Scaffold this active site. Sequence first.
Site, mmCIF file in Angstrom:
data_model
loop_
_atom_site.group_PDB
_atom_site.id
_atom_site.type_symbol
_atom_site.label_atom_id
_atom_site.label_comp_id
_atom_site.label_asym_id
_atom_site.label_seq_id
_atom_site.Cartn_x
_atom_site.Cartn_y
_atom_site.Cartn_z
ATOM 1 C CB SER A 131 -0.919 0.046 1.218
ATOM 2 O OG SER A 131 -1.519 1.315 1.383
ATOM 3 C CE1 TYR A 144 -4.776 -1.655 4.633
ATOM 4 C CE2 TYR A 144 -3.772 0.408 3.961
ATOM 5 C CZ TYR A 144 -4.317 -0.801 3.641
ATOM 6 O OH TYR A 144 -4.363 -1.162 2.331
HETATM 7 N N1 LIG Z 1 -8.517 -0.061 -2.525
HETATM 8 C C1 LIG Z 1 -7.481 0.703 -2.168
HETATM 9 O O1 LIG Z 1 -7.473 1.931 -2.227
HETATM 10 C C2 LIG Z 1 -6.245 -0.004 -1.655
HETATM 11 C C3 LIG Z 1 -5.114 0.762 -1.369
HETATM 12 C C4 LIG Z 1 -3.964 0.159 -0.904
HETATM 13 C C5 LIG Z 1 -3.958 -1.211 -0.721
HETATM 14 N N2 LIG Z 1 -5.055 -1.936 -0.980
HETATM 15 C C6 LIG Z 1 -4.909 -3.406 -0.735
HETATM 16 O O2 LIG Z 1 -5.301 -4.152 -1.826
HETATM 17 C C7 LIG Z 1 -5.725 -5.466 -1.369
HETATM 18 C C8 LIG Z 1 -7.142 -5.745 -1.808
HETATM 19 O O3 LIG Z 1 -7.965 -4.701 -1.339
HETATM 20 P P1 LIG Z 1 -9.397 -4.287 -1.999
HETATM 21 O O4 LIG Z 1 -9.448 -2.791 -2.107
HETATM 22 O O5 LIG Z 1 -9.601 -5.133 -3.219
HETATM 23 O O6 LIG Z 1 -10.307 -4.791 -0.734
HETATM 24 P P2 LIG Z 1 -11.769 -5.544 -0.766
HETATM 25 O O7 LIG Z 1 -12.336 -5.469 0.613
HETATM 26 O O8 LIG Z 1 -12.552 -5.045 -1.945
HETATM 27 O O9 LIG Z 1 -11.299 -7.091 -1.081
HETATM 28 C C9 LIG Z 1 -10.283 -7.717 -0.334
HETATM 29 C C10 LIG Z 1 -10.535 -9.237 -0.296
HETATM 30 O O10 LIG Z 1 -9.657 -9.813 0.679
HETATM 31 C C11 LIG Z 1 -10.391 -10.759 1.367
HETATM 32 N N3 LIG Z 1 -9.917 -11.070 2.690
HETATM 33 C C12 LIG Z 1 -9.844 -10.255 3.801
HETATM 34 N N4 LIG Z 1 -9.396 -10.880 4.847
HETATM 35 C C13 LIG Z 1 -9.169 -12.170 4.416
HETATM 36 C C14 LIG Z 1 -8.697 -13.345 5.019
HETATM 37 N N5 LIG Z 1 -8.359 -13.352 6.293
HETATM 38 N N6 LIG Z 1 -8.588 -14.487 4.295
HETATM 39 C C15 LIG Z 1 -8.941 -14.443 3.025
HETATM 40 N N7 LIG Z 1 -9.390 -13.401 2.342
HETATM 41 C C16 LIG Z 1 -9.506 -12.309 3.081
HETATM 42 C C17 LIG Z 1 -11.801 -10.157 1.479
HETATM 43 O O11 LIG Z 1 -12.780 -11.077 1.837
HETATM 44 C C18 LIG Z 1 -11.974 -9.582 0.085
HETATM 45 O O12 LIG Z 1 -12.488 -10.552 -0.794
HETATM 46 C C19 LIG Z 1 -5.618 -5.454 0.151
HETATM 47 O O13 LIG Z 1 -4.339 -5.888 0.542
HETATM 48 C C20 LIG Z 1 -5.748 -3.944 0.438
HETATM 49 O O14 LIG Z 1 -5.215 -3.584 1.675
HETATM 50 C C21 LIG Z 1 -6.190 -1.372 -1.447
#
Ligand SMILES: NC(=O)c1ccc[n+]([C@@H]2O[C@H](COP(=O)([O-])OP(=O)(O)OC[C@H]3O[C@@H](n4cnc5c(N)ncnc54)[C@H](O)[C@@H]3O)[C@@H](O)[C@H]2O)c1
Length: 245
Positions: A131, A144
Amino acid sequence: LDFHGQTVWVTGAGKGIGYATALAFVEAGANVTGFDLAFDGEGYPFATEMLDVADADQVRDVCARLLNDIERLDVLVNAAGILRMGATDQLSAEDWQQTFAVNVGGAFNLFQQTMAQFRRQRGGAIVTVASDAAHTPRIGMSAYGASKAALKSLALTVGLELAGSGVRCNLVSPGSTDTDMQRTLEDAEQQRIRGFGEQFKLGIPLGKIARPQEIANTILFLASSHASHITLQDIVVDGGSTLGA
Ligand SMILES: NC(=O)c1ccc[n+]([C@@H]2O[C@H](COP(=O)([O-])OP(=O)(O)OC[C@H]3O[C@@H](n4cnc5c(N)ncnc54)[C@H](O)[C@@H]3O)[C@@H](O)[C@H]2O)c1
């Protein structure tokens, strides 16, 4: 980028960036398995495995069953993650523990159960989604960001451990991306692009937030043979908001 006949595993594949990434690998010809706590979609264009990546026992069992049946794990993508926000001294004890169990422990568990496979096969690629909060302090996201900085460090040391086996290990650090995790916090997007000078949060020079496909395409590049000499790198995908930090 052609991944034909490659076995690809993607965590967090039930939606968001993980879903987008697993779909992009399918679109590139790969034999894709997605892992997630829940698959709420009616149908998925890839194989799906229920798995809580924070559960070391569950991860050992699922990996052992699947690794029985494949000669090669060509790509592992760690994209499971949760976002729990709060001022540091207000964050609940559960939010702290779960943030680290999932965001660091998950990859740790997958690494512990797949590294032997990577050493035995002598090759492969790992991409871990960190991130931009691991690159710059973010008010409201102390835990986070800390968990994502621990994830990055872990992935780089695992990359160093596996480099002698020819495995490449890299990361992508997204900025704000249009997914479920971001929508929870509709002028929000324009204000993110503009920035919050009061919170010491820079706007987005490119004037837009990220699309999940834009994160996915970066993961595929790093997983691909085009990146055959790239390892231990972290590409920030954030329209320049961290100014290269
Ligand atoms: N969206 C953003 O702006 C952003 C920014 C930086 C990082 N991220 C990172 O990108 C990745 C995906 O995020 P996203 O935005 O798609 O989130 P989201 O909530 O849309 O999807 C994330 C997925 O991870 C799964 N998950 C969570 N905990 C879990 C576990 N213990 N076991 C298995 N699956 C699990 C959830 O069920 C979900 O399907 C994450 O690492 C998030 O931190 C997102």
